[PDB]
Design an enzyme around this catalytic site. Structure first.
Site, mmCIF file in Angstrom:
data_model
loop_
_atom_site.group_PDB
_atom_site.id
_atom_site.type_symbol
_atom_site.label_atom_id
_atom_site.label_comp_id
_atom_site.label_asym_id
_atom_site.label_seq_id
_atom_site.Cartn_x
_atom_site.Cartn_y
_atom_site.Cartn_z
ATOM 1 N N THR A 198 0.986 -1.281 0.311
ATOM 2 C CA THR A 198 0.583 0.692 0.210
ATOM 3 C C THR A 198 0.967 1.122 -0.233
ATOM 4 O OG1 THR A 198 -1.929 -1.604 1.577
ATOM 5 C CG2 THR A 198 -1.605 1.513 1.039
ATOM 6 N N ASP A 239 -2.526 3.873 -4.004
ATOM 7 C CA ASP A 239 -2.384 2.524 -4.930
ATOM 8 C C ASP A 239 -4.038 2.718 -5.440
ATOM 9 O OD1 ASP A 239 -2.234 1.689 -2.328
ATOM 10 O OD2 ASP A 239 -0.975 -0.258 -3.427
ATOM 11 N N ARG A 242 -3.985 -1.604 -5.208
ATOM 12 C CA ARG A 242 -4.077 -2.831 -5.062
ATOM 13 C C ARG A 242 -3.756 -3.554 -3.582
ATOM 14 N NH1 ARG A 242 1.829 -5.492 -6.497
ATOM 15 N NH2 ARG A 242 0.728 -5.134 -8.647
ATOM 16 N N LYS A 286 -8.395 3.380 -1.753
ATOM 17 C CA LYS A 286 -8.116 4.340 -0.628
ATOM 18 C C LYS A 286 -8.568 5.271 0.453
ATOM 19 C CE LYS A 286 -4.593 0.196 -1.749
ATOM 20 N NZ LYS A 286 -3.278 -0.362 -1.542
ATOM 21 N N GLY A 289 -3.383 -0.357 5.140
ATOM 22 C CA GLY A 289 -3.319 -1.717 6.535
ATOM 23 C C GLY A 289 -4.266 -3.207 6.516
ATOM 24 N N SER A 312 3.348 0.153 3.363
ATOM 25 C CA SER A 312 4.500 -0.599 2.759
ATOM 26 C C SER A 312 5.632 0.169 2.229
ATOM 27 C CB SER A 312 4.240 -2.146 2.433
ATOM 28 O OG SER A 312 2.612 -2.267 1.270
ATOM 29 N N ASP A 322 7.183 -0.880 -4.774
ATOM 30 C CA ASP A 322 7.115 -1.710 -3.187
ATOM 31 C C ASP A 322 6.865 -3.828 -3.854
ATOM 32 O OD1 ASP A 322 5.994 -3.648 -0.858
ATOM 33 O OD2 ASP A 322 4.273 -1.905 -1.114
ATOM 34 N N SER A 338 2.599 -2.672 -3.574
ATOM 35 C CA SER A 338 1.266 -1.961 -4.517
ATOM 36 C C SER A 338 1.672 -2.010 -5.258
ATOM 37 C CB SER A 338 2.887 -0.257 -3.621
ATOM 38 O OG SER A 338 2.195 -0.587 -2.176
HETATM 39 C C1 LDZ Z 1 -8.001 0.406 1.969
HETATM 40 C C2 LDZ Z 1 -6.380 -0.476 2.581
HETATM 41 C C3 LDZ Z 1 -6.369 -1.001 3.977
HETATM 42 C C4 LDZ Z 1 -6.838 -1.779 1.313
HETATM 43 C C5 LDZ Z 1 -5.591 -2.745 0.568
HETATM 44 C C6 LDZ Z 1 -3.952 -1.520 1.056
HETATM 45 O O1 LDZ Z 1 -3.829 -2.025 2.732
HETATM 46 N N1 LDZ Z 1 -5.173 -3.471 2.274
HETATM 47 C C7 LDZ Z 1 -4.103 -4.400 2.142
HETATM 48 O O2 LDZ Z 1 -3.286 -4.574 1.070
HETATM 49 C C8 LDZ Z 1 -4.422 -5.774 2.751
HETATM 50 C C9 LDZ Z 1 -2.848 -6.905 2.478
HETATM 51 C C10 LDZ Z 1 -2.103 -6.778 3.892
HETATM 52 C C11 LDZ Z 1 -0.787 -6.330 3.779
HETATM 53 C C12 LDZ Z 1 -2.301 -5.733 5.000
HETATM 54 N N2 LDZ Z 1 -5.444 -6.738 1.934
HETATM 55 C C13 LDZ Z 1 -6.166 -7.276 2.925
HETATM 56 O O3 LDZ Z 1 -6.435 -6.821 4.151
HETATM 57 C C14 LDZ Z 1 -7.242 -8.356 2.399
HETATM 58 C C15 LDZ Z 1 -8.588 -7.389 1.928
HETATM 59 C C16 LDZ Z 1 -8.435 -8.080 0.157
HETATM 60 C C17 LDZ Z 1 -8.726 -8.949 0.500
HETATM 61 C C18 LDZ Z 1 -9.057 -7.300 -0.793
HETATM 62 N N3 LDZ Z 1 -7.538 -8.616 3.721
HETATM 63 C C19 LDZ Z 1 -6.890 -9.384 4.284
HETATM 64 O O4 LDZ Z 1 -5.795 -10.088 3.919
HETATM 65 O O5 LDZ Z 1 -7.540 -9.491 5.619
HETATM 66 C C20 LDZ Z 1 -7.347 -10.949 5.739
HETATM 67 C C21 LDZ Z 1 -7.496 -10.427 8.256
HETATM 68 C C22 LDZ Z 1 -7.290 -10.985 9.124
HETATM 69 C C23 LDZ Z 1 -8.098 -10.951 10.435
HETATM 70 C C24 LDZ Z 1 -7.173 -10.062 10.726
HETATM 71 C C25 LDZ Z 1 -5.956 -8.972 9.559
HETATM 72 C C26 LDZ Z 1 -5.858 -9.640 8.259
#
Ligand code: LDZ
Ligand code: LDZ
Ligand code: LDZ
Ligand code: LDZ
Lengths: 202, 204, 196, 212, 212, 220, 200, 196, 202
Positions: F1, F17, F19, F33, F47, F129, F166, F169
């Site tokens: 991100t 971004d 993604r 985001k 996050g 990140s 990244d 990202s």
């Molecule tokens: C608006 C942003 C927060 C959206 C995006 C940007 O960070 N989210 C992300 O990139 C994170 C990656 C992680 C390293 C934080 N991915 C996510 O949060 C994905 C959501 C997508 C599948 C739609 N969901 C996920 O992995 O959550 C699992 C989880 C479950 C319980 C606790 C913590 C995490």
């Protein structure tokens, strides 16, 4: 523990506290952490008592044989190299922070820090031990290039006194040694002889 | 390894005025299959469906608790739920369990109750909605399903081509997953009809 | 572990359970019954942790019996299976979870015979035949190789015998006697225990 | 080193037209404390190769001794053959991979820069035997803070002059001082060209603006 | 201290009737960062054989150098170049020699058999190998295998003629599969290195993927 | 991100971004985001997606109830205080790193909130990140009191640094510009990366898939 | 993996599946899990693919050196003892290797189960793998020393098929070998998908 | 676990062992022999970790058969027990310990019948009767209640059957068949297997 | 972090570095660790940012209500006591080292150190943070009773500079504040304004 070595034109001034501790008990309250490795090369020891003593004996043995064969006064860089080689080859088995200071006919007064890990650096002034952490600011504000032997003696006394007043593992008497071509001159500061700084009392 | 305990795979794909939702049919514990006819896709309206993959207890519980809220909403609001509102509702249920979640990730496939426009979506296990205009996958063969749908999906596919794409993507992806398969079911949702088909699949 | 088996036929449901209760290396009972009469046409075969099986099974039994008293009619096999699943699933994320694997079997005069497999996580599946226990690994294939949807109650008992004979030859646990019961339009019928 | 002790921060390198430039701060940190603030983490191997290292300084001093002796040994032969930047980079990869496989790794990330046969070499050697060559390299936090800026320039303009390369390094060194907590303002720059390897003195990124 | 690091990487190999295609991405990565956007994972062993290696780049560099030495050693004692099957068999023994400290590498060998037909051998980190017609390995192995099983194997499809695979359809499938993997795998996506082995030799082609 | 934010002469430019990744696989190639907190306040989120898309949604509801009662435009300080006082009572269990930016009656205000409750009012901020790649661009090119086009080019360059450097990202670049006179939400501001063109046709014609059963239910 | 072997009146029938898995990922469905040590001796592979493949190839090289030195083919008992003694040296180090050594010696048809945990036992019917339990039920209910060759072939195929159906780690094609005095033969390699149609 | 029982009488030593080779819930053999002939008058019954049993037992057997070849006479039951105890105690603190519980039964012309007990820790105990396994906990008391130092070899097989039938009623593991052998002045005699 | 406060006859001087850090990353390079709890009472925060910001916000709220109810300017001891109450009550859930220094009409300029654990102590001068260790000997050697606001401002600037040069978790700009009956004068030292000390050469 607090150990300090300072260079001056003609020689170096070494100094240390006198407190060996096991936990919060002082086993030796009058320890000598300044050990003669050769005639004009001493080492200020810090870290584990057994490791420091074993390494200093081995380096004295090696340096003495080397000086007899070469038939010349040894170099302080050679003493620092032998400590670094042993303290790097056994970095995972030895807790030994050492400061090698001495005089040689070639490079005169030289201070070398061989911190835990086995690195060796030539320094104008070196500080080691658990009490060094409290004197870093003081030594960086009061150090001045061009200090005499007498000033370097007073500088080391004030620094060791300040760390013995804030570190539990530091204390006792301040042992100081000034090495030059003339020879080594060792002294002990006890009680009032130890520099005193007024504690701020509201 | 809490999602691979019971296995599973669900996929939803968009077409021109049509949606598709497919699911594997195996119900198993670790490496033992117990049934080959488990339901993972549930009707949430005439042209609205939800496929649930994860722990099978959570698939059944989340479906039943979603129907409780949906029937209450439909009777009180006196209208069918629009595809997007159901997604917002599933997100609320899943996030109400944020610290101690249901091990199920849902895909919603449906046509708007009035405009009949194709809507597909996927939510995480804590309720994070992601609306797509192509395809949505969820399960233990997700990576395999991503590669198949990214290389086979075309825009404006007709109802018959949508069936041939969702079916081929599901059959070749579950055939590379050991804990998913034992059959594949596909629902093609159109404005005037709901065709359900079971595919000839490897039963190994 | 303990063994539960169920074979659903066209008009009947045949169930069997081991009759052994073990402490550690000693069988303290060889006449144990792991089948509970929920209704006149519903049986719950339960295996699992000690104390959890009867505490959960007796609870489900008294609640199904309260339904008959409160409404004048009995819960159907499917309603009973779902009521059990909700209670096992609603105590899973609680501090008092029940470690129990079950097999509900019943006969609705309308939907006919039914056998329901449920694991400790509370996943309910309707099955033509199912088994619970380590013996299921050595018997589920015998049922898959010979089970036919139109099996007679006589051929069903024969396949039950094939599966229990396999347990005597390949299983490492001494499971000698089996409680065998059948359910139909006329209710639950106890059959002779298949002993070895 | 099973556990690193006095360590150095990031080392940066960028290949320009006619040579390569590497940069390193002159600080050895003992776990947050900036204990040794005048140590060189850059080394001239031969007349065509220079090495900058991050990680344990004792492990780097050991390498300076082994690689230093290897160069003295080949020169005594006087056969017109000399270790090249790619040969030293090959030797460091084999040295680190062997130590990692003995489970006794040299805790050091190195950047080798060299100019031989009108060709600029810039190689990367980690403590696990991971090695690669690139137009620009950055070790430690320099990978997440400086490599982005370097790569942006080396994409629009693939070939940089020595002046453009030095300017890019000074800007990357400034960013590292602002956001890296193990960084010192006093730093050294080394350039290898047809005229050999040169190491600039204690330069400062006094270009530090503080509109707090 | 952890001796291994996943450095990303995807490798594919398709065997034909007179051609074998070994292909790989050119991205080296550590964590959520990119080391280099130009590290191909394919290596020519003989004029008729190419190997693809992905996983820990430290072990990949070591294994390839070990394989090249062993190839020259076989030629010295047997007075002939090693066959694709002989290299496959030797690799299995070289990999199992380190069974208690395995090479974290995924290897797919592509070449021509002694009859001039294509030959793909897939290998597991500790030895296990098998002759295949197509194989994907690395970060996006699970995203590429399914489509190859459907298109090259013609699986789960009825009323479809099993035509022999042309090099052009093979080339287009390799490019298409890597573009899909790039859009969903974070470790794949700088450029594609396609190496084609034929009677003429090993031609190499590079295509651009998507930079994160 | 890679979410970033800068304060320029007339207001605030926020960027992000698009993604979302589950593990090391991309799940959404077009996530939003940047979130609406109030007509004058927007928040970029990094996050846990569910936590950043619920902490923001709850604060938007509470500032709406506050603005309906007050009859006045919301102050960015109210959003920061509400968000920080909630993230603190959860001790980093709700992983929401946010870049809060808006123009109120006291001018433009940009803040950084961390999952534990810490806030920081700064002229330029980066989170995710891809934060250090974005910070390198800001610490190298940020100048006080810039113009919108200059400040927008800066936030796009910072987001690009995270997208191309990244691995968590990537995809498109969204920019939200907020002035005292205008709120411009440019969702697809820049599309830097695209999927390559398909070179072969793999479409399956009718009859390729063999079915075992079929049931058509007519819908009225 | 589901490997099976039974000694009957007409020799020893050896059967196996073809699936290899890296976790829940089917890496292959065409793996050959039967090793032809000699024209009369064969080994089955269950467990770690590399472990089983490496030590059965080492046994094949050892058994050839035996024939060249002693001018006679090793016995099934002597081959199983070599494999057991070899794997015992690395006990506790993590080798996963379940195998069955089948063949015709001077004592006649022989079948031995050698495991990486030190187990070497002779028997008439063995089943090794994650589908072993599933296959044991079918083979046991259908086993008979006086089984006819075709009945024996059908029993082996059904037992492997019924296990590929209940085990997620077993599937692919049932490969059938028949070891007889003249030496083993490769009878068939039927895919479980076509056997699902046949058995239904 | 595997079961071993030895009962020594006035001029003979009767021994028995279970005949099952198990592998995780499954019995992979029902005709296993856990008794190894060392001499024409000494039997070693070994049980324990897989590999260790046959590896250690075959080693002692070959070294005992080597003593007869080099010396022309055979080792006594006591010398064989002492030789085995040393070979297990020396490997005890080694990197390759053997986990083997053993009963040595043998007859000497001068010392007469002798039964020896040894555990994995390598303690050698001479006993009138002995057993190894979890079944020893259910059978050693029956042997204590009915064993008399002057028991005949016919009454001894009856006491053995009482112990084995107690395993068929109270033990949780299926040990259906037991090998039986007797050693006397005429050597080792294989009596019919006691099966249930 | 380096926080420092000193009392003079008429008020108190406070100082701090400006560095926030996540590991070895500087999240904020211009942080204000000198927070105003009331008109003439400020706090120097060290430790956790979220924990210190939450407690300072809570005490400002409680202190504000107390001052409006008791129509009188707040006492520095009351603010220190409210800080002590929370930091002791949540000592196991709060990482927060605070220096409460300010001017009150009754007791003059007072510097109170409420360290980690919840303890509270009045001090002539107070230091806190990770950089506090490197300047203990300096403050003990350079502090003199009877210093002025100008001398006290130099003591704080010189001491913080030495600590910021030795502590990696300390650095940025030196933020200074002088509180007296007249008001609160705030000052930021940046670049060459920040006191410098010559390094060695050897
Ligand atoms: C608006 C942003 C927060 C959206 C995006 C940007 O960070 N989210 C992300 O990139 C994170 C990656 C992680 C390293 C934080 N991915 C996510 O949060 C994905 C959501 C997508 C599948 C739609 N969901 C996920 O992995 O959550 C699992 C989880 C479950 C319980 C606790 C913590 C995490
Ligand atoms: C003697 C100098 C090398 C410095 C000296 C003074 O602190 N170092 C020490 O005293 C260190 C401190 C630390 C390693 C616990 N203490 C020690 O090395 C040991 C502690 C044992 C558990 C090994 N202290 C001890 O046992 O005293 C031995 C001793 C007593 C008197 C003189 C010399 C040595
Ligand atoms: C030995 C035969 C039975 C062949 C084959 C068929 O099942 N064996 C297997 O599939 C089993 C998988 C599982 C049971 C551990 N063993 C295996 O080794 C296979 C190897 C390849 C075929 C993928 N799966 C696997 O997990 O190996 C990956 C691996 C990589 C490095 C070290 C150790 C293991
Ligand atoms: C009290 C303030 C003046 C902060 C001051 C400390 O003295 N300076 C600091 O550098 C302290 C160091 C501390 C851990 C000892 N920094 C911090 O406490 C940092 C500040 C955050 C805004 C990133 N807090 C922290 O590490 O955990 C919060 C967090 C939550 C999510 C991501 C990253 C960080």
């Amino acid at each position: 523990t607090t150990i300090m070595a300072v260079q001056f034109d003609g020689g170096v001034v070494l100094g240390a506290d006198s407190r060996t501790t096991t936990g919060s008990y002082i086993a030796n309250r009058v320890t000598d952490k300044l050990t003669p490795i050769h005639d004009r090369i001493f080492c200020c020891r810090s870290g584990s008592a057994a490791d420091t003593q074993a390494v200093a004996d081995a380096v004295t043995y090696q340096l003495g044989f080397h000086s007899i064969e070469l038939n010349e006064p040894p170099l302080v860089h050679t003493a620092a190299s032998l400590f670094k080689e042993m303290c790097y080859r056994y970095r995972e088995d030895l807790m030994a922070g050492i400061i090698i200071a001495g005089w040689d006919p070639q490079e005169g007064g030289q201070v070398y820090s061989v911190p835990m890990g086995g690195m060796m650096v030539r320094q104008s002034f070196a500080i080691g031990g658990s009490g060094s952490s409290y004197i870093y600011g003081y030594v960086d504000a009061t150090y001045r290039e061009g200090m005499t032997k007498e000033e370097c003696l007073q500088f080391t006394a004030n620094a060791l006194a300040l760390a013995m007043e804030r570190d539990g593992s530091s204390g006792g008497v301040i042992r100081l040694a000034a090495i030059a071509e003339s020879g080594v001159e060792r002294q002990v500061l006890l009680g009032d002889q130890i520099p005193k700084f007024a504690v701020a009392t509201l | 390894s809490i999602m691979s305990y019971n296995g599973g795979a669900v996929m939803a794909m968009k077409g021109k005025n049509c949606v598709a939702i497919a699911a594997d049919r195996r119900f198993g514990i670790q490496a033992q299959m117990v049934t080959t006819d488990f339901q993972k896709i549930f009707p949430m309206g005439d042209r609205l469906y939800i496929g649930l993959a994860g722990l099978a207890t959570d698939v059944q519980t989340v479906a039943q608790r979603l129907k409780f809220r949906l029937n209450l909403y439909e009777l009180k609001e006196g209208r069918q739920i629009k595809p997007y509102t159901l997604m917002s509702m599933v997100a609320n249920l899943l996030y109400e369990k944020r610290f101690g979640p249901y091990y199920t990730e849902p895909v919603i496939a449906g046509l708007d109750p009035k405009t009949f426009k194709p809507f597909i979506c996927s939510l995480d296990l804590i309720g994070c909605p992601m609306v797509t205009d192509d395809f949505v996958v969820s399960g233990t063969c997700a990576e395999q399903m991503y590669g198949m749908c990214e290389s086979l999906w075309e825009p404006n596919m007709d109802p018959d081509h949508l069936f041939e794409t969702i079916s081929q993507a599901m059959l070749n992806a579950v055939d590379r997953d050991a804990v998913s398969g034992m059959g594949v079911i596909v629902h093609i949702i159109e404005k005037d009809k709901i065709t359900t088909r079971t595919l000839k699949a490897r039963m190994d | 572990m303990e063994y539960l088996i169920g074979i659903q036929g066209p008009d009947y449901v045949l169930v069997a359970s081991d009759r052994v209760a073990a402490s550690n290396i000693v069988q303290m009972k060889d006449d144990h019954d792991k089948m509970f009469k929920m209704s006149e046409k519903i049986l719950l075969l339960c295996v699992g942790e000690a104390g959890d099986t009867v505490q959960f099974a007796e609870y489900i039994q008294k609640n199904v019996q309260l339904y008959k008293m409160r409404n004048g009619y009995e819960l159907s096999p499917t309603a009973a299976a779902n009521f059990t699943r909700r209670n096992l699933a609603d105590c899973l994320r609680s501090r008092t979870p029940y470690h129990v694997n079950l097999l509900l079997a019943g006969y609705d005069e309308h939907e006919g015979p039914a056998l329901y497999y449920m694991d400790y996580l509370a996943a309910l599946a309707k099955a033509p035949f199912a088994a619970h226990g380590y013996g299921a690994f050595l018997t589920l294939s015998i049922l898959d190789r010979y089970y036919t949807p139109t099996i007679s109650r006589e051929r069903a008992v024969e396949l039950l015998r094939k599966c229990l004979e396999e347990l005597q030859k390949r299983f490492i646990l001494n499971l000698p006697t089996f409680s065998v019961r059948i359910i139909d339009k006329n209710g639950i019928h106890d059959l002779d225990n298949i002993s070895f | 080193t099973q556990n690193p002790m006095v360590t150095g921060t990031s080392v940066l390198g960028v290949k320009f037209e006619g040579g390569v430039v590497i940069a390193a701060d002159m600080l050895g940190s003992y776990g947050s404390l900036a204990r040794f603030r005048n140590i060189s983490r850059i080394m001239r191997v031969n007349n065509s190769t220079m090495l900058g290292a991050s990680g344990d300084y004792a492990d780097f001093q050991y390498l300076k001794q082994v690689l230093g002796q290897m160069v003295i040994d080949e020169e005594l032969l006087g056969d017109g053959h000399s270790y090249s930047p790619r040969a030293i980079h090959s030797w460091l990869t084999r040295a680190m991979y062997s130590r990692r496989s003995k489970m006794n790794p040299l805790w050091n990330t190195m950047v080798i820069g060299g100019y031989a046969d009108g060709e600029s070499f810039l190689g990367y050697v980690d403590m696990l035997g991971v090695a690669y060559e690139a137009p620009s390299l950055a070790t430690g936090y320099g990978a997440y803070l400086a490599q982005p800026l370097l790569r942006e320039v080396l994409e629009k303009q693939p070939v940089l002059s020595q002046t453009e390369a030095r300017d890019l390094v000074e800007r990357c060194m400034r960013v590292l001082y602002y956001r890296d907590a193990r960084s010192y303002n006093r730093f050294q720059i080394a350039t290898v060209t047809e005229k050999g390897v040169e190491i600039e003195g204690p330069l400062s990124t006094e270009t530090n603006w503080d509109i707090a | 201290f952890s001796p291994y690091v996943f450095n990303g990487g995807t490798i594919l190999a398709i065997a034909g009737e007179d051609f074998a295609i070994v292909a790989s991405d050119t991205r080296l990565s550590e964590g959520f960062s990119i080391h280099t956007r130009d590290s191909p994972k394919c290596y020519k062993l003989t004029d008729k054989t190419v190997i693809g290696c992905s996983g820990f780049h430290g072990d990949c560099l070591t294994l390839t150098k070990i394989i090249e030495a062993r190839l020259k050693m076989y030629k010295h004692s047997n007075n002939k170049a090693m066959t694709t099957g002989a290299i496959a068999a030797m690799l299995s023994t070289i990999l199992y020699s380190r069974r208690f400290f395995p090479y974290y590498v995924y290897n797919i060998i592509g070449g021509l058999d002694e009859e001039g037909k294509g030959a793909v051998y897939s290998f597991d980190p500790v030895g296990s190998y098998q002759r295949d017609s197509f194989k994907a390995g690395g970060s996006a192995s699970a995203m590429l295998q399914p489509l190859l099983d459907n298109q090259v194997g013609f699986k789960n499809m009825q009323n479809v003629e099993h035509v022999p695979l042309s090099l052009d359809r093979a080339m287009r499938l390799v490019k298409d599969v890597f573009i899909s993997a790039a859009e969903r795998d974070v470790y794949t996506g700088d450029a594609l290195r396609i190496c084609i082995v034929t009677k003429e030799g090993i031609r190499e082609e590079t295509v651009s993927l998507r930079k994160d | 991100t890679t979410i970033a934010g800068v304060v320029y002469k007339d207001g605030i430019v926020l960027g992000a971004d698009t993604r979302a990744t589950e593990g090391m696989v991309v799940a959404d190639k077009n996530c939003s985001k940047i979130h609406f907190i109030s007509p004058n306040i927007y928040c970029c989120g990094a996050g846990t997606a569910a936590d950043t898309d619920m902490t923001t949604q709850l604060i938007s509801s509470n500032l709406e109830l506050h603005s309906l009662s007050t009859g006045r435009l919301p102050r960015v300080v109210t959003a920061n205080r509400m968000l920080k006082q909630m993230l603190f009572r959860y001790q980093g269990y709700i992983g929401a790193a946010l870049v809060l930016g808006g123009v109120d009656v006291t001018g433009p205000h940009l803040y950084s909130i961390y999952p534990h409750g810490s806030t920081d009012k700064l002229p330029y901020v980066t989170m995710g990140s891809g934060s250090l790649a974005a910070m390198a661009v800001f610490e190298d090119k940020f100048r006080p009191d810039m113009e919108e086009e200059e400040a927008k080019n800066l936030v796009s360059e910072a987001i690009a640094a995270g997208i191309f450097n990244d691995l968590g990202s990537g995809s498109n670049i969204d920019l939200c510009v907020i002035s005292k006179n205008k709120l411009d939400f440019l969702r697809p501001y820049t599309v830097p990366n695209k999927k390559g063109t398909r070179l072969g046709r793999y479409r399956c014609e009718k009859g390729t898939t063999a079915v075992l059963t079929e049931k058509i239910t007519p819908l009225e | 993996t589901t490997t099976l072997a039974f000694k009957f009146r007409h020799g020893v029938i050896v059967a196996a599946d073809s699936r290899a898995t890296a976790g829940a990922y089917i890496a292959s469905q065409t793996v050959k899990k039967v090793i032809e040590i000699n024209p009369y001796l064969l080994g089955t592979m269950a467990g770690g693919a590399a472990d089983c493949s490496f030590w059965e190839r080492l046994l094949a090289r050892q058994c050839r050196i035996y024939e060249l030195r002693n001018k006679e083919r090793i016995s099934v008992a002597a081959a199983s003892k070599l494999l057991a003694n070899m794997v015992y040296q690395y006990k506790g180090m993590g080798l996963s290797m379940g195998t069955m050594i089948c063949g015709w010696d001077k004592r006649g048809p022989g079948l031995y189960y050698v495991d990486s945990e030190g187990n070497r036992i002779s028997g008439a019917t063995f089943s090794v793998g994650s589908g072993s339990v599933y296959a044991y039920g079918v083979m046991d209910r259908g086993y008979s020393y006086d089984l006819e060759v075709e009945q024996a072939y059908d029993l082996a195929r059904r037992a492997i098929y019924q296990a590929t159906y209940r085990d997620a780690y077993s599937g692919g094609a049932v490969n059938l070998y028949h070891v007889r005095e003249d030496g083993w033969i490769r009878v068939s390699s039927d895919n479980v998908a076509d056997l699902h149609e046949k058995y239904s």
